[PDB]
């Protein structure tokens, strides 16, 4: 046989899982933190093991 | 140890890719 291949935001300090609705804010909802980071992509990323 | 594996196992990986 063969073998084939194989918008959440994060609060910078409280690490909460944010989902920013259409034009709401750029602030965390649990604490007032204004820094949000994109979560890692859900799709496959392939690397050479070298 | 002291037992041959080359005799009993056919070396496939040694063929030129």
């Amino acid at each position: 046989x063969x073998x084939x291949x194989x918008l959440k935001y994060i609060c910078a300090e409280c690490s909460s899982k944010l989902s920013l609705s259409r034009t709401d804010a750029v602030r965390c909802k649990d604490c007032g933190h204004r820094i949000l980071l994109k979560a890692r992509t859900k799709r496959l990323v392939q690397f050479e093991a070298r | 140890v002291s037992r041959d594996t080359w005799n009993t196992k056919n070396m496939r990986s040694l063929e030129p890719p």
Binding site: I10, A12, S15, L37 | -
Partner: protein, 67 residues
């Protein structure tokens, strides 16, 4: 950062010896040289692999952003 899997010069696996080296140093404390020799790190390249490693990943993990 984290201990390299293999010695740069030899290719000998040293990534499975970091923790045993740390426990040799801490539990029933040994000198660094005898701890390295007890792990089979005979050649000086494999010796320096463990002797000179700076475990920076532990310091990096203090800033874990996904708490």
């Amino acid at each position: 950062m984290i201990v390299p899997v293999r010695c740069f010069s030899c290719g000998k696996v040293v990534g499975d010896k970091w923790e045993s080296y740390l426990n040799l140093l801490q539990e029933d404390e040994l000198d660094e040289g005898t701890a390295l020799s007890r792990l089979g790190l005979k050649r000086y390249c494999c010796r320096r692999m463990i002797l000179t490693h700076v475990d920076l990943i532990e310091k990096f993990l203090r800033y874990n952003p996904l708490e």
